Structures are given as C-alpha cells and as structure tokens.
Amino acid sequence: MEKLKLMTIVGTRPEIIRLSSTIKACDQYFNQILVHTGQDYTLNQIFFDDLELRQPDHYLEAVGSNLGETMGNIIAKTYDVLLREQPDALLILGDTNSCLAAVSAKRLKIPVFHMEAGNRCFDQNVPEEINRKIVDHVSDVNLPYTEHSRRYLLDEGFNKANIFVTGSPMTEVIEAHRDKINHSDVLNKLGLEPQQYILVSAHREENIDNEKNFKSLMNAINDIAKKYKMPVIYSTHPRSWKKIEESKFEFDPLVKQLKPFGFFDYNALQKDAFVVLSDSGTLSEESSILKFPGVLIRTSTERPEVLDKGTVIVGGITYNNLIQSVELAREMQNNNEPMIDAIDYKDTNVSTKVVKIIQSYKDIINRNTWRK
Amino acid sequence: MEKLKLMTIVGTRPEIIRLSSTIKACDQYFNQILVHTGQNYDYTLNQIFFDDLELRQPDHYLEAVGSNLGETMGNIIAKTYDVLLREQPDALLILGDTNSCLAAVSAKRLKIPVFHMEAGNRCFDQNVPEEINRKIVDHVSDVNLPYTEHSRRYLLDEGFNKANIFVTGSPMTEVIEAHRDKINHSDVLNKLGLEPQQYILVSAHREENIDNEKNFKSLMNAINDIAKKYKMPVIYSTHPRSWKKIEESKFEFDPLVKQLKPFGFFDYNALQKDAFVVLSDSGTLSEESSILKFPGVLIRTSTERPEVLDKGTVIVGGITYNNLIQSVELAREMQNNNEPMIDAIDYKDTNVSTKVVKIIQSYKDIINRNTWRK
Amino acid sequence: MEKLKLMTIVGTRPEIIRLSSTIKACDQYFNQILVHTGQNYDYTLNQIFFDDLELRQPDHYLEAVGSNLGETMGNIIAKTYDVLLREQPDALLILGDTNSCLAAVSAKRLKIPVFHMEAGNRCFDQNVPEEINRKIVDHVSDVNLPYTEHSRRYLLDEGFNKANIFVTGSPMTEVIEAHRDKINHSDVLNKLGLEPQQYILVSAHREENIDNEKNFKSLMNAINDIAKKYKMPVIYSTHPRSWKKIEESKFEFDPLVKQLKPFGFFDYNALQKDAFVVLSDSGTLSEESSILKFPGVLIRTSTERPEVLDKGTVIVGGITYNNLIQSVELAREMQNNNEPMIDAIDYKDTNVSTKVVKIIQSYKDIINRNTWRK
Amino acid sequence: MEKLKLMTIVGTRPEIIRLSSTIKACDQYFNQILVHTGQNYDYTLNQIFFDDLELRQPDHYLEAVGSNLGETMGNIIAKTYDVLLREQPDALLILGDTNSCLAAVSAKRLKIPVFHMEAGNRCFDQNVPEEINRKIVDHVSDVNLPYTEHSRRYLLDEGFNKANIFVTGSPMTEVIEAHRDKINHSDVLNKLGLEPQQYILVSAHREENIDNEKNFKSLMNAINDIAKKYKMPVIYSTHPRSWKKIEESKFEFDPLVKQLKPFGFFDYNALQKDAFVVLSDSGTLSEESSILKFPGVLIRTSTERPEVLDKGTVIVGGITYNNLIQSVELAREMQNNNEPMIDAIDYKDTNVSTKVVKIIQSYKDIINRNTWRK
Amino acid sequence: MEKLKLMTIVGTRPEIIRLSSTIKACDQYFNQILVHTGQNYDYTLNQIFFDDLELRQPDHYLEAVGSNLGETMGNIIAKTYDVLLREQPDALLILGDTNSCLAAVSAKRLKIPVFHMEAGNRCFDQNVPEEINRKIVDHVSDVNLPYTEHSRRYLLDEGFNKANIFVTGSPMTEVIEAHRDKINHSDVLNKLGLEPQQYILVSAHREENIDNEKNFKSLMNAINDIAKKYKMPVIYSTHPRSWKKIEESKFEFDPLVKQLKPFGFFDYNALQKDAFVVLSDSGTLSEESSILKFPGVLIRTSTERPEVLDKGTVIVGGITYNNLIQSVELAREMQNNNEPMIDAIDYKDTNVSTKVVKIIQSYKDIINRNTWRK
C-alpha cells in the first residue's frame, strides 16, 4: 500500500531546527519530499553535523539580485517542484519567503499545513509581519504554538474547525539533543568559565541598519562589559563588525567577536552564560526550557505566554532599560527566584501530533475546501 | 431539611452512561426524579443492563414515541410538559443532543431553570443530524456546561451569556474510574478466545456510515483488506440492517471478520483497550482512546472532540477506502514504535458529578432572579 | 414550466396581515401551498376578516391546539412534520415568533430550506415570552430575512451565517400602501360618532400588561386621569377577562372611556391615524405610527423596534402610572408644536414581496448544495 | 545604576494583603514609593495592620476622604494627581476596584504607564457598586493584569489591546504560602475554646447583605435555624450598624451564636480552614476556600470567581432563607463523604510578584513608545 | 402635570453650541436644570454669548476649577455630586469628552440614568488628550447617543449594551438650520473688508499643532508659502501663546497674513463659507464643510469624522509642511473644476433635539428597571 506523500519546505536555520524532529518523524510514517529554496557555511553544520538530518530531495537555488526577484523565484520554482511531485499535502513553518510556497500550493489545490501559525508582535515595522499575515490566511490547516496564537487566528475569523495547537516544537528538539548540549566542550574551547561571560546576539535588521538604535546597543554592550568585568561574547553579522570602526573602537578588551556556532554549541553557551541579550526568535523559548536569564532585545515580542509566567524581560534599545533589564535579570537569578514552564511548551510530542493532524485533515480539507 | 427537586430527563443508553456517576450524586445530595422518554415494557429483560451500571431505575417512563420521527418529537414535548407540571421540579438536568433534550423547550415555557451538560458540541457539518438539536437545546438552556474550553469558546461566539457557562470536563474519565474494576476483571477476551493485541475492533453504527450506498462499499472493502493484510480476527459491531444487505454478492471479508453480540460498556471497553487497533465512529472513541490509551481511528469526516487532535490521541480515518487504510497502518505503525498517548486537558478531571451538583444548587436561584425575576 | 413548490405556514392574524402582500406575490410566481395550524370549522364567520383583505384561504388546516400549551407545541411539530412529508415542498416560508413557526424544526429534519422573515427580533428581556421561540427558530432557519440592519447585526453577533442573511425591510409599509384607498375612504369615524383629532385610542391585549395585578392598576388608573385631563372620548380595546374584572370596586372608570368592537385592518388604522394620541402594545404600534404619521405611546418596557427611536417616531410609555401620564402629555405637546415625524431607513422600501420571491428562488438550490449537499 | 521608579497606590485592607507579596518584591528590584489614600493621623492601627503581615510603612498618606462620596472621590483624583507630579515616577501599580485606583485617571493624564492587577473582574450585576469603578479603571489603565483566563476573555471582548493583557494568576496562593506557618502554628482555636470541625463561621460585611431590610431578615433567620439544626457554636462576624440592629425582639437565634473580635489575616484563615462550614460575602471566600480546602458558601447572587465553579471548590448560597439552609446542608453533606477539592488553574502559580516585576520593566518603556510616542 | 426633571451639565462654548438646539426642546418638553462647571462672573462676555444662541442662562454655575488639571477634575466630580443630590433629577444629559462630563461618575453613584451625545468618538491616537475621557464617559454612561453608525459599531466592539445605543445623527445641521438666517445675513466680510472667494482661513487652536515646536514650524513656514503662492490675505485664528512666541525673528511672515479676534458662531461660519480654502483642526470643520459646502483641509493626523472621507467632503492636510501645501492645492484645484461636495448620511437629519427628548422620556425608566432594578 502507497503511504501519504507530504512535501516539507525549509529555507533558514530556525525553519530547519524547529522542523528538525517533525521532519525525522514525517520520514518514519510518510513519503516525505524535502524541498530547500535558495539560501551557508554554518547552516551545513546544524543540518548534517548537529541535527544529523538527511539530505533534501531538491535544492531550488532561488535567491537573485534584489528581494523582489528572490520572492518571484521561490513562488515560481516552488510552483514547479509542486507540479513535478504532486504531493498529497504541504508542510510549512513560519514567516520566511520560503513559505510563499503556500501561494503556489493553494493554486494547485494541494492542502497546506502551517506550523508557527498566528504569530503576532503587533508592530508593522517588523519585516516578518508582512508574510505572517498572507500565509496564516491561505494555509488550509493552521497549527499555532500557543493558545494566544489560536486566539489571534480566531479573531481574524480563520476557520475555527481547521486550527490545532501543537505546542512549541523546541522542547522536543532540545530534548532529543540534550546529551550533546551538556557534553558540548564549547566552553573549554573558548577558555570560558560558567556564569563568567555575557553572550549577546544582535542579528536583526532594525537593531543595526537603523542608526540611533545600533548606537544605543553598542554603548550598552561596553558598559555591560565594564559593569561586571566578564568577557562579552558578541555574535552579530560581519558587516555589523566592519561597520563598528568609524573611530568608535573602545569595545573594552573584553568585547570579543564570536564565530557563528551550531545548535548544541550555541545552546550550551546560552545555558551556562551569566546573562543572554538576544533578538533571536528562539530566546523566549530557549530561556524557558534550558532555564537561563534572557533580556530580550526587541520593542515587541510574539511570545507573551512567557511574560504570563515570568520567564523573560524585554530590554528594548534605549540604553537605560537594557542596563536596568540586565541588572534586574541577574539580581532575580541571584535570589534563586522561580522560573516556570509556560503552559504550551510542556508537550514534547509535537512531531507525532502534526503527522497525525496531516493524516486526519488532508482528506477533510479536500472534502470541505476543494470539494473532491 | 427540605431538598432541591431535580428532574433529570434521559432517553438513550449513552446519555445515561455519562450521567451514570452524575445521577448517583444527585440522588445523594438532591431529591432527584429520574424521568425516561422511552418504555420499560420490554425492559424486565434489559433491566439488568442499566441496573448493572449500579444505578437505581427511573421513577417515571414517559412511553413517548410514535409512527414517524415527528409524532415522536411532538410527544416528547407534551409528555415532558405534563410530567414537569405534575412534579413541579426546581430544575431540569439534561445531557447532549438527543430528541429527549427538547424537554428543555417545555421546562423553558414553564420557567424551570435548565442545566445542559455536553454544551457547545460542534463538528460544523449541518449534513450531520445531531447538529440540528445541538443548536436549539444550547440556546434554550439557562446554564450551559460544555466538556471543554473549545466548546465554551464555540458558545461564547454564538453569543450566549458569559456568566452562565462552566467547563465541567468530560464525564467519561470519572465513569470509567467507577468501573475500571469491572473492566480489568473482564472475561470477554477469554469468552471470545482472543489473545490481547491479536484482534481488530470495528464499531460502525451511524446512518451515513451504513446507508449512503457508496460509503458502505469503501468500508466493507477496507474491513476485508484490513483482515487480509494483518491476518487477525476483525470483531465487527454494526447494526442488524447492514447484516441484511451484506448477505448478497460480496462474502469476500474472509473467515476472520466475525459478528458481535451487544456487549455492556464494562465488557466492550476491555475489548477495545487490548485491541490491536479500533475503528469506531462512536462519539466516545475520541475520549475512550485518550483514557484507555488504545489506537483509535475515527471513521467520520468531522469531530466535536478536537481537544484529542491537539494532543495526538487519535487519527481520523475518514470514509474513503485509501485513507481508511493509510490511517490504520499509521495507528499500528506508531503503537509498534511506542509513540506517546497523552491526556487531553479537560479529560484530566474526575469530580464532574460533584462539580455539576454545586453548580445546580448555586445557579438554580441566580436564574430565577436574573432570567425570570421573582 | 413546473414552478418552485413553496409551503407558507401561518397561525395568528398579525402573522397573516404581514405575510399578506408577500403571499399574494408567491401565488403569482410560485406553486404556493398555504397552511394554517389552528381550526376552520368555526371560521365560517372569521372567513370575512381574512378574505376582506382580498387574501385567498389556506389549502390545508391542521386543527392543532390541545389541553395545554405543551400538548399543542407537541402537536404543531408532528402535524407540520406530516403536511411537509405529504406535499414535499422545495422550501418553507415563515414569519415571526409564534408557536406556528416551530414548523421549521420539522422542515429542518426533512432537509427543506426554511426562509424566516422577522428574523433577529430582540428586546433583550427573556421575561418577554416571544424571546423563547425567537432564539430557537432564527438558529434552525437556513435563510434569515430581518426587517432591519439592527437585526442583521443582532444575528451576526449570535454567530449566524454571514452569507444567508438579507434585509427585506419592514413588510408593513408595502401592506399599508396596498390598502390606503380602503383606509382614507373609511366611515369608521362616522360609524362611532367621532370627529378626527378628538379621541384617544388604547390597545392593551398583552397578558402581563393585563393579568399582572399592579400593571393593571397603573394602566386603568391612567386611562382614567387621561380622560378627565384631556376631556375627550377614550376608545379602549382590551380582552374580555379585563372588562370582566373592571366591574368591581374601581368600577368608576368615568363616562368618556368606551369599549371598541373589533374592526378590520383598514378600519383600525383609519382610526389610529386620525387619533389625538394612541396607547398600544401591538408590535405594529412602532411601524404603523411611522408609516401613517400619528403620535403613538408603546405600553412596554422594551421594544424590538429601536430604528423608530433612532428617528424620533415614538415615545415608550412603559407600565408605571407616573410615566404614561408624561409620555402621553409629551406625545400631544409635541404634535401640537408641528415637530417632525421621519421615515425610519428600513421602513421606506415597499417591494418586500418581490424581494422575498427573488431571494427564495436564488438561495433554495444554494441551501441544498451547501448545508445538505445534493 | 538607577532603578525603575514605581509608585504603588493603595486604599482598603484587602488591597494591601493581595499586594503584600507583590509590594515586598518591587521594593527588592525597584525604587518603590508606596502611597495610601486614607489618613495616618491614627498612627497605631495603620501600623498594627502592617506589623503582623511584615509589610513596610507607606512613604506617603494622602489624608483624602471628605463629607460625602463625591467630595472624597474627587479628593483622590486631585491629591493623587499631585503625589504623581511631585515624585515623577516611571509607572503606576494598582490593585482592584476601590476608589483608590481613580489614581489611574490622574497618572494617565500625566502620561504614566498604569499597571492594574485584578483586571477584568466582572459579576455582570450593575446593582453591585464595584462594577462602576471596574469598567472605568480597566479601560484607562495601559497594561491590564487579570488573575484568570476568564478575566482576559472578558477584557478582549471589551476590545482592550490584545498585546497588553497578561494573566498573573491569583496573588492569594502566594500571599497564603508566604504566611503558611503563621497559620498552622496559630492559637485562635485555643484562644476561643473550639475543637476543629466543631464551629460554623459567618462573615456578612457587604452593605445590601445587611442594610437591605428583607435580606437582613432571611440571613439572621438562616443563621438561627443553622445554629439549632447543627447545634454547634456559630462565630458571627459583621459590621456593628447590624449588631446594634439586633435589639428589638428578633434577638432570639439561640445562645450558640457568638460575636467575633476581628483577627489579623493569619488567624482568620486558621479559623476558616478548620471550620465545619464557612458563610461569607468576601470575594476572598472563593480563593481562600480553594487554597485551604474548606467548605465555603458565598452569600451573594454573583461571583467574579467563576473559575472556582469550573472545579467545584464552592457553592453560592444567595440571600434567600431556603437556598441558604440547603447550600449549607450540601457543603457539609458533601464534606461528610470526603468529596474532592480541586485546585483551580489560575490559583496554581505562586510567583505573581516576580511576574509583575518582570512585566513592569518589559512593558513600561513599550507603553511610552506605543501609547505616548516618546 | 408634573414633568421629568432633567439636569443638562455643560462647561465649554462648543459643548453648549451643539446642545443649543437640544437644550431649547428640553425647556419645552421637560423641567430642565442647566448646570455650568465654570464661573459667569463676567456679565460682559458670558451674556453676549447666550444672546446670539437665543438660549436662557444656566440655572446654576459650579465655578469648579483650580490650580492644576487635577484639582479642577477633582472638583467637577465633587461639585456635580453636590448639585446632583440637591435637585434629585430623574436623568442627566451630557455632551462629548470635556472634563465637564466626569459629571457622569458622580451621577452614576447616585443611580441617576445618564444620557451621552457625541458618544463613541474615536480618532484612535492615544496621544490625543480627548481619547482618555471619551473612553471613561462612554463606559460609565447608561444610554449612549452616537452621531454616526460608525460610532455605534465602535461602541458595540467595546461591548456596550446593544439595547442602549441610538444614532441621533450630528446635531450641527439642526443648529446651522436654526441660524443660517443669521449666517447668510452677516457683515463680517463687509467689516473685515474681504471679497468672497478672495481670502484663506486658518483655525489652528490645538496644542500639539502649536506647542510641539516642529509642528508649529512646519505650519507657520506653510501659512507663508500659501499667502505667497495665492497672493490673498490669510485670516489666521490661533491662541495668545503662539502670537507671543511667533514674534521671534520670523514675525515678518508676509503683509498678507493678518490677525483674527474671536468671532461668534454665526460670523465665523459666515467667514468660513465664503473662504477660498479653510485650514482647521476644530472638530466642526469635518461637519461645518459637509453642510456649509466649502473647501476644508484638516490640520490633524487623525479624525473622529471618517463619515466625511467616505463621501469625499474633506482632505486631511496633516502637520508636515509638504503634505499641507499639496492638500490646499488639491482643495483649490478641485473646487475650480467644480467637483461634488455630498451630504454625509448621519448629517442629514435635523430633528436631533426632539429625537433625544423622546429617547430620554423612554429610557429614563427602562434604565431604572433594568440597570438599577427598582
């Protein structure tokens, strides 16, 4: 007997990392066509080496000069591999262009399952929020992480029949590899002593290319080095480092430039840090699971479930609240003050919840939406 | 003392099974008059079945029913209206979406507070018959007690009174508890001589899983090829009507497929819980598979129990041959990989009986005041 | 040709008066089977009123009604269930919130599209007995045609289907139109020995304006101190049980108040228009006052006609003495100062007949493909 | 360093108890300026209160309050408005629906982020004086911190900003853990010479349970025939405007009914926990009975704590003699049989303090950007 | 006779102007007590003001006000409560989002029904200071009376009582009607000696269009380049504070730019209608230009009058210099091509005075029974 043919599409790190355990299970129980769009030196590490994940059945080589082309391609290329394979159903995660795949899918009346549905920061100025909107509303079955997201989705009048709450995939994903995270010798290979180094991740566009903001960050990254006197392990984009000349320099001795690390290594680093300042998507969750002090360096969060439990503090950019936040963050953890699992992160069986939703709801959408 | 007069109105077996524990507690703490809409006068043979539930018999058999589904509805309104006039009870307690629950229409015209368990029960497929009464009985009830937050949500969107909804939980976990003794000490396996994990169960009792001449072909054809592929008996509990229509042309479902007798809850749950796989359309399945952690495959096109799909407790087989197979193969393949069965959020609680009781005592008066003014 | 076979189901007079114009059309464009829940045996005197009105007579009568409200519901369902099963209509028409329109409950089971005019009627006081049927039939109906945006809103918020709602607008302007020759050419001012603008009219027919002991006292006490204050006739139409009780201690009443012999539609409105002030509790009090611009003072403590307050074409007298005095003092004191009466939006169109006809044709097949899928 | 400057404004005692755990925390992590609206010029009491509870002394006392509610309301706005303008704080922390938290209306003008715990409190009876201030402060505050998911649902539906609603959980489960020994190593049972499970407790402080002449009757009546029925001591706690009102012939209700000397927080709860049954009209009755698992009976006709009925931690007596004796019988009848007492969901967590700290830092600067564009 | 006792409470000239036509009808039909929150102490201007509006003087003058926006809020609450006790009026009539309508906080504590015109005003910019009181006084009012069907929708989505909202339409048409005599015969063009269509009007009264220095620069800079490009005199009405800080180097701005005195409703409207272009932030502009059909450009970032953008009767020029010049061109360049000005739907009705009066006599009591159960 032929097994259900699913197509699963990824493009960025976190796409690949959160799907990581959901892809391995969709191999077990389905006939999974793994597509990969256009877009990386240290993404070959988390694929293959860390996640020990199996090769894609297609790389599409989308990319191009200028955003407009890339978005164009992904739609077109995606359109073809969806004609050429005719899968019964499509898996998509999140807010990247690599899930503009949903538009082509929808045209070819192929049912769409979207994990990381209903994601809302409620600031238009965040680039993510343009797709986020489109693709929530074009995916036939929406699988949001939280109930916050299920609420958000119902409120924009999306079919309450075709919503299921997976919970976060990131508990399961961290669990699977927990061994490798605690056995990471990454500390011993940077000569770093647990709770005596501060890790920073300013990767985001609105924290570098916007002018006043980058200034606020950087001035604080110094004062944070000085105020505690442990090495600051600063992980950004290269341009961000080349751009930090313009005769500002200072950066104490202590502020180090930091190689982009794999999953285990970067987590192991996070887990045993003094404080983490990250604009990372995974922070709100990484901090809640691996139990560590994170100041979240955004002006908005899509992960409120965590504020509801006192697991995170929201820095922002203006210098004072970053400082205040990090002093709050440590003072708190220095009084062994409770840090509780968020409700929707407890379940570690996301992989199988989704495989069962796809088997269940492929026909049901064909029957309902498309009338076959 | 002076006690609260509660008339609890029922009519179908599953109705009762779910009220089973709930009725017991209403006898304890109230003056419960238990009305039935059906007959007792073939029911000195079938009195065991629904005493063996360890339950007192009803105080009143309305012997409603007539020529057509119509006369029979008509009756249940009038015959209830009457028994409600006679006993003049303080509150009406009602389960689910049967024709019994039109009793609410009568109690309502008579300004008796109405308390409807299993509220907000939605599969969103108007072609499903249950869904007609569901809509009516939810909106004419005064206190709505859905099993789930899903079902609270559904009610709050249809614009029902915020103040008068409570999430009781599913009654099943508690029932199954007050009988897991009877279940675990069940011969049924040794009566039918089956090894545990070496038989497959198929419960197919619904019009539109029996009648729609096409669906009955996709299924019979799949009950065959299931037998063929696994090579184990295939205990098949359906209606008599189908047995009439299957004794023509196609015998093809092997020696292995067998007929079932009726079997009381106690026996039937011991038969489900050790089955290799269970293909049911019984509304329970969703709940029973969560509780008695077994491989469940819903042969429907719509659920009122999505809280299960949220947790990964069930797979929905559907009614097309091809998926009905893919679906069983997915069930077995994941039990054999020892994947997890996980408790739904609203199925965790076992104190539903006592939960309703306080609710009824509380909101009896609150409804006379707010909704009627007295 | 063969034409759309359309059962139309009525009960009370007010129900038929509104459906009047709308039936007449259905008769021209469709194969309309009219049907009446009550009795005809006696009717060989009533015949007049509900033929004078030029309305043809029901194809069937259901001689339902029983020992108690309760028998009689139980009847209309089973009775209506059959009239449908026989004549096998393509679709059901229906108006308002009488027990006559539990007809839907059956029509729904038998997979007949129901169209329900006077949809989304709400006053938001469940003490008002109409509020019980209102909720039920709106949710069992397949297409709701409310008179106003107001109700379309009410409905959407009860989470009803966006796509199966149309605002017919009030059918009362179309019907008052079709009879304004038979209204402006009526003797009924002569008949009763009355000059125009020289007589108050009072209609208290609602129970609980009447039965309720205090409400009677206030109301009666008022109709008095009105007649003395304004010193003109006070033409009064109530039920008999009130007159029966009026011959008591407070017999006084005063010589100016008279009884009113029940007069046909034409005559009753011809009365109301040329009246000095009107106190009624008819649902029509709101609409009629609007369409024939006269001062009306609703004896109630809720409307389902807010649209009329949005334009200032009615005061709400209520039930208490002190108010009704002021409300009527207001009413007159305003029409004395030439203050404007304004058409409400949803009362201006007069094609409600042809609208329903065009809507019923359009959506009949839709409601099958969609809800029932054939 | 600099720290965030948090003004915490308080008024009534229950406000200060719930904030107790949360205040001690903002002191630890912030520059907290605690402000009381009432008068200090009676020193002792304002300081024997804070002492047994271990809360610090307020930096400031607003000696507002005037001839009437109206003068005193407006004194809080203007005196509050001033304390805010002087201290130029970063943010405002507020609990509940006392006249104190009109302070928001001031803060909001001076563009100070308001954080408002016990948000979305709704019992849906506008008769109940709290529901006035409830609507107002909820909707002027910039971040609403509702105890439960219920109160979130309420708020979202009043279309408050999605993005600034966080569910803290109830702060009682924390306050009550933080004084758990002070309770269990407490004398109050020796002090008064009572064996556990051997005394009933009655607290009726709410005006309208007391100052309403009918309700007063039924309660005193019901406290009477309780004392007689169960023949135990009945430790009564009520305002003295009521006591003084016992002198005129209805003084009877047996000798077992005692007065109550008020008791600090620790001791009153110890009294409640070990009680046979508790009647009270405290909003704390709901929570206290859940967390210390004793059989409570709310003497109201509305909760703002429906979460507790979702689990069956409580019964609602009402004010009627009948439904009160009944609801007490149930409580102990259902205690007798060791029926379960289940933790409500939003009463579980006990870090409500650290939640509120982490939130105020997070969202203070967010509000300045979003609302006030700085 | 004995008539309903209304207390209408005002505080500001533009408040009064809108009520002008409503107030007059309230002297006719009720016993109206007209309270004011400020002082008269100034026969000189406070008498000439009520001269033109043909309006009786206020019955009372609370003189509320003091040191800071805080004292003055606090007082309107206390001083309103006092005068509300004394007169024990049956109902309170209130307009808009001034501090004067904090009157409803006090009245609401004395269970006096509150009626609120200009209900449901939302521009949706939380930085705009009216948007604080708008939120409070909408949610503490008992019956809301929005101008627009927009503002109904807005009030409905903050979950306000469906039964207690009524769309009056805008009161401005009515007040312009009740003068357009005085307007069409105005010497203000003779007096200031401007030919019609040959001057440009700029009404810049809002703080935030004056105090926020960048806004003040982008506007002044703008007023010049307009004076210059068109070569017409520029009637410019603003506050003292600007003039004082406008003469700071760049006081020279063109000979063409001239000074305004205040001018009456009649004169300023008369000046408006015959202007070439009119730049305003006066909320009126949105309406004043739908009605007296002139080119309006709104110097603002938000509108509480979308109904106008729906029909194409105004351009929102905003505060940034560039978009201002483009906006004013777009006005002239469009009026020269003679492009359609069109009536806003909710601005057509002219019987708002009466409309309210009936709605008060009606819901005065409905509210005492429903909200206050009496």
Q: Which residue of D has its CA nearest to B167?
A: D310
What Rg, from alpha-carbon coordinates, does chain D have? Answer: 21
Q: How many CB pairs under 8 A join B and D?
A: 80
Q: Estimate to the nearest angstrom the gap between the alpha carbon of B174 and the chain centroid.
A: 14
Report the run of H or E that residue C201 belongs to, with start and end.
strand C200-204
CB D14 within 8 A of CB D121: no
Residue E86's contacts (CB-CB under 8 Å, 6 or more residues apart) are none
Distance from CA of C43 to the nearest CA of B (A): 26
Nearest CA to D242 among D220, D264, D221? D220
Chains B and D touch (3+ CB pairs under 8 A): yes
Distance from CA of D312 to the nearest CA of B (A): 4
Chains D and A touch (3+ CB pairs under 8 A): yes
Q: How many other β-carbons are positioned within 10 Å of the β-carbon of residue D1?
A: 7
Whether residue C327 and residue E361 make contact (CB cut-off 8 A), yes or no, is yes
Residue A294 bridge partners (DSSP): A276
D126 contact residues in E (CB cutoff 8 A)? 371-372
Q: How far apart are CA D215 and CA D318, in angstroms?
A: 10
Q: How far apart are CA C284 and CA C203, in angstroms?
A: 11
Q: Which SS3 state, helix, strand or coil, does residue A278 take?
A: strand
Residue carrying structure tokens 């194409």? E312
C306 contact residues in E (CB cutoff 8 A)? 163, 166
* Resolution to one decimal, Å: 3.2
> Mind giving me the DSSP string for D233-264?
-EEEEE-HHHHGGG-SSTT-STTTEE------
Nearest CA to A358 among C4, B177, B334, E195? B334
Residue carrying structure tokens 């000074």? E259
Could you tell me the CA-to-CA distances from C251 to A85, B274, C212, C225, C322 in Å, in that order?
92, 82, 18, 14, 21
Residue carrying structure tokens 């630890």? D28
Distance from CA of E348 to the nearest CA of D (A): 30
Q: How far apart are CA C184 and CA C201, in angstroms?
A: 18
Mutate to test the interface with E, among C307, C311, C314, C345 (most CBs of E within 10 A): C311
**B199, two tokens:** 């038989």
E116 part of the active site: no
> Mind giving me the DSSP string for D88-154?
--SEEEEESSSGGGGHHHHHHHTT--EEEESTT---S-TTSTHHHHHHHHHHH-SEEE-SSHHHHHH
Experimental determination approach used: X-ray
Q: How far apart are CA D60 and CA D89, in angstroms?
A: 14
Q: How far apart are CA B209 and CA B238, in angstroms?
A: 10
Q: Which SS3 state, helix, strand or coil, does residue E83 take?
A: helix
Residue B2's contacts (CB-CB under 8 Å, 6 or more residues apart) are D322, D325, D326
Q: Which amino acid is at A80?
A: D
Please, what's the b/e burial string for E59-68 (b: 16 or more CB within 10 A of its CB; e: otherwise)? Answer: ebbbebbeee
Q: What are phi and psi of A140, to 5 degrees?
A: -80, -45
Q: How far apart are CA B53 and CA B10, in angstroms?
A: 15
Residue carrying structure tokens 């100062």? C337
Q: How far apart are CA E37 and CA E39, in angstroms?
A: 7
Q: How far apart are CA B344 and CA B285, in angstroms?
A: 13
Give the nearest partner residue to A340 out of D349, D364, D366, using CB atoms: D349
> Mind giving me the DSSP string for A119-134?
-----TTSTTHHHHHH
Give the nearest partner residue to B29 out of D154, D325, D334, using CB atoms: D334
Q: How far apart are CA E58 and CA E37, in angstroms?
A: 10
Whether residue C309 and residue E359 make contact (CB cut-off 8 A), yes or no, is yes
DSSP strands (E only) in chain E: 5-10, 31-36, 60-61, 91-95, 114-117, 143-145, 200-203, 234-237, 257-259, 277-280, 296-298
Classify burial at B59, counting beta carbons within 10 Å of its beta carbon; exposed 0-12, middle 13-18, buried 19 or more: middle
**D239, two tokens:** 């305002």
Nearest CA to E306 among E345, E349, E348, E280? E345
CB C135 within 8 A of CB B140: yes
> Mind giving me the DSSP string for E242-272?
HHHHH-SSTT---SSEEE-----HHHHHHHH
Nearest CA to B314 among A116, A142, A359? A359
Mutate to test the interface with C, among E362, E372, E373 (most CBs of C within 10 A): E362
Mutate to test the interface with B, among A145, A153, A175, A352 (most CBs of B within 10 A): A352
Q: How many CA atoms lie within 13 A of A25 on its CB side?
A: 27
Longest CA–CA span in chain C (Å) reads 68
Classify burial at C86, counting beta carbons within 10 Å of its beta carbon; exposed 0-12, middle 13-18, buried 19 or more: exposed
Classify burial at C337, counting beta carbons within 10 Å of its beta carbon; exposed 0-12, middle 13-18, buried 19 or more: exposed
Q: How far apart are CA D56 and CA D287, in angstroms?
A: 25
Q: How many other β-carbons are positioned within 10 Å of the β-carbon of residue A27?
A: 14
Q: Which residue of B has its CA nearest to C76?
A: B74
Q: Which amino acid is at D262?
A: P
CB C278 within 8 A of CB C295: yes
Q: Please state the three-class secondary structure of B207-276 as a single string.
A: CCCCCCCCHHHHHHHHHHHHHHHHCCCEEEECCHHHHHHHCCCCCCCCCCEEECCCCCHHHHHHHHHCCC
Query: In chain B, helix, strand, coil percent, each to 5?
Result: 45, 10, 45
**Choice among E139, E150, E185, E205 that is catalytic:** E205
Whether residue B366 and residue D316 make contact (CB cut-off 8 A), yes or no, is yes
> Mind giving me the DSSP string for A105-173?
HHHTT--EEEEEES-----TTSTTHHHHHHHHTT-SEEEESSHHHHHHHHHTT--GGGB-----SHHHH
Q: Which residue of E has its CA nearest to D77?
A: E74
Which residues does chain A break after (C to N > 2.5 Å)?
39
Whether residue E127 and residue D157 make contact (CB cut-off 8 A), yes or no, is no
Dihedral angle at the C-alpha atoms of E272, E276, E281, E287, nearest 10 degrees?
60
Distance from CA of A261 to the nearest CA of B (A): 32
Q: Which amino acid is at B23?
A: I
**E260, two tokens:** 């305004």
Residue B204's contacts (CB-CB under 8 Å, 6 or more residues apart) are B210, B219, B236, B237, B238, B242, B279, B281, B299
End-to-end CA distance of chain E: 23
Q: How far apart are CA E346 and CA E356, in angstroms?
A: 15
Classify burial at B365, counting beta carbons within 10 Å of its beta carbon; exposed 0-12, middle 13-18, buried 19 or more: buried
Catalytic residues of C: 205
Any idea what DSSP says for residue D162? G
Dihedral angle at the C-alpha atoms of E356, E359, E365, E370, nearest 10 degrees?
-110
Q: How far apart are CA D128 and CA D141, in angstroms?
A: 22
Please, what's the b/e burial string for A44-83 (b: 16 or more CB within 10 A of its CB; e: otherwise)? Answer: ebbbeebbebeeeebebebeeeeeeebeebbbebbbebbe
Q: Which SS3 state, helix, strand or coil, does residue D297 take?
A: strand
Q: How far apart are CA A302 and CA A204, in angstroms?
A: 15
Q: How far apart are CA A268 and CA A291, in angstroms?
A: 12
Whether residue C77 and residue B77 make contact (CB cut-off 8 A), yes or no, is yes
Q: Which residue of E has its CA nearest to C319?
A: E365
Q: Which SS3 state, helix, strand or coil, does residue C346 take?
A: helix
Q: Which residue of C has its CA nearest to E364?
A: C323
CB D90 within 8 A of CB D111: no
Q: Which SS3 state, helix, strand or coil, does residue D188 take?
A: helix
CB E358 within 8 A of CB C309: yes
**B277, two tokens:** 């796989």
Q: Which residue of C has its CA nearest to E25?
A: C334
Nearest CA to B159 among C154, E293, C246? C154
CB C52 within 8 A of CB C264: yes
Q: How many CA atoms lie within 13 A of D351 on its CB side?
A: 20
Mutate to test the interface with A, among D365, D368, D371, D373 (most CBs of A within 10 A): D365
Q: Estimate to the nearest angstrom the gap between the alpha carbon of E172 and the chain centroid.
A: 9
